[PDB]
Amino acid sequence: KKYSIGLDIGTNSVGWAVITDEYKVPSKKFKVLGNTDRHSIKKNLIGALLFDSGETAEATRLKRT
RNA sequence: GCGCAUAAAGAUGAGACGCGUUUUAGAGCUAUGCUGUUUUGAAAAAAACAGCAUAGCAAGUUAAAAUAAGGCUAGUCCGUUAUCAACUUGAAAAAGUGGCACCGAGUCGGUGCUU
């Protein structure tokens, strides 16, 4: 049916959530490839991605000079 | 929702200067002791020849090399930073790729259809 997506951004992380019409976090079975036994795993649709801060170009410029 | 004043901030790109690092050249020395030693020889002993150890000293400032390895594009140019999930094509770019009604919830487990 209908659904909405919530986001939370920060310099190191992106908290992401997807809500539906009835304010409930959906649970869904997703297929799992590879060569393991679990071919599908029912998980939820919410989390947050972490990553290193994007670096500037000052050091490289100084080294160039 | 701009044209604007004040006070700040950031970012970019060049041009250059102080070192520094590590090498070499800073011709450092003295005495003593050790063995091998051409050694005077048949051996001994060094001139310790070769180094070694013990102490004691003495100066000490600087000069040169490069400074990402390197690259070729031989320029007086480039090379440290953004820009990388798995995956199939596609040279690359780029594209596609994994279901869902429902019940629970320990790194999730099922479930109707059903991959």
Experimental method: cryo-EM
**Residues of A with catalytic annotation?**
8
What's the start-to-end Cα distance of chain A, in Å? Answer: 58
Residue A7 Cβ < 7 Å to strand B: no
Calculate the alpha carbon distances from A50 to A2, A14, A15, A17 in Å: 28, 7, 9, 15
Q: Which residues contact A25 (CB under 8 A, 6 or more apart)?
A: A17, A18, A19, A44, A45, A46
CA of A18 to C1' of B42 (A): 106
